[PDB]
């Protein structure tokens with residue numbers, strides 16, 4: 326109950342000072358829907374300069390910067406209404422106080438706006454040097470980009486599987502009054518609870534459920550609209566990843582297979598699913614799309630694949646190895662890169678990675694697979 330009141334007061338503050346408009350102005354309309362990695366350790370100094378020089382350092386924006394970049398604000402310099410909120414946020418662990426109590430600064434949550442929603446995310450993904458516990462990324466944004474929002478009815482039943490911060494569920498909640506959001510991690514489940522309240526939603530229009538993906542998929546509930554950005558990264562045998570990163574199956578795509586295979590049953594006829602994954606492939610395209618011809622022929626589906634980023638597998642060796650080394654606390658003499666290269670070649674057959682959003686529709690009047698590449 327005190328946390329809920331604190332989040333209500335945070336929403337009041339964000340409304341009072343026009344947070345979403347400020348964020349939107351800073352990042353601009355040609356970046357707002359590209360990626361959440363806009364305000365980061367590398368751009369924070371320029372954000373601070375904007376507040377200082379273009380917004381005049383006004384005290385009403387001091388608490389906002391604590392939330393947005395982690396910048397310290399002197400406690401006595403906060404406006405009276407903001408000061409009590411700051412204290413409540415410190416009590417909730419959503420901001421820090423300095424040891425002498427004379428200032429407030431960032432904790433592990435960063436405030437952004439995405440797709441018209443206000444969102445706390447894990448600050449560690451864009452700042453600092455400790456591994457994050459809640460994922461968000463450009464792939465999250467691109468799977469939402471392709472949803473045709475004008476086709477969503479207020480009565481449509483929607484589900485966001487593997488919800489994380491809640492971003493896709495909260496986006497869907499802009500249009501339909503029936504959204505289910507699922508996860509199994511303690512940390513993302515607590516965060517989507519906060520973000521639901523931060524956007525004036527509650528259990529009356531969006532249910533948050535602790536439930537395994539495959540349990541929701543086997544269930545009897547039927548949906549008109551489904552979104553899922555599942556764990557999809559394949560790591561070599563013997564390496565531990567994280568809950569949000571490591572996909573199941575030999576090639577990391579087991580959860581994608583699980584979802585697609587149940588779509589004819591879990592979607593109402595004519596319903597649509599939107600998935601996103603970084604898919605291994607050869608020069609012609611992602612391997613996974615070949616598995617989907619069985620859903621065109623077997624179920625009369627229309628399947629559209631939007632390839633928005635292409636990288637050679639060699640360009641992912643470092644990022645994968647860095648992530649594995651950081652996540653498990655491994656030392657610097659381990660030849661992780663060779664293990665990743667061998668796995669890409671022998672198991673994944675990955676010459677390239679294709680960041681792909683996939684729309685799948687049942688009972689299609691124009692069934693077929695369509696792959697869009699630039």
Ligand SMILES: Nc1ncnc2c1ncn2[C@@H]1O[C@H](CSCC[C@H](N)C(=O)O)[C@@H](O)[C@H]1O
Nearest residue numbers: 460465487488489508509510537538554569
């Ligand atoms: N078996 C499973 N069932 C349900 N959720 C799972 C799961 N395995 C992992 N997860 C959750 O899957 C999420 C993948 S990250 C995607 C988060 C969010 N939908 C976004 O697009 O940004 C993580 O939050 C993780 O906790």
Ligand SMILES: [Ca+2]
Nearest residue numbers: 350351352353
């Ligand atoms: Ca800018």
Ligand code: NA
Nearest residue numbers: 369370373396
């Ligand atoms: Na700084």
Ligand code: NA
Nearest residue numbers: 554555556557
């Ligand atoms: Na994912």
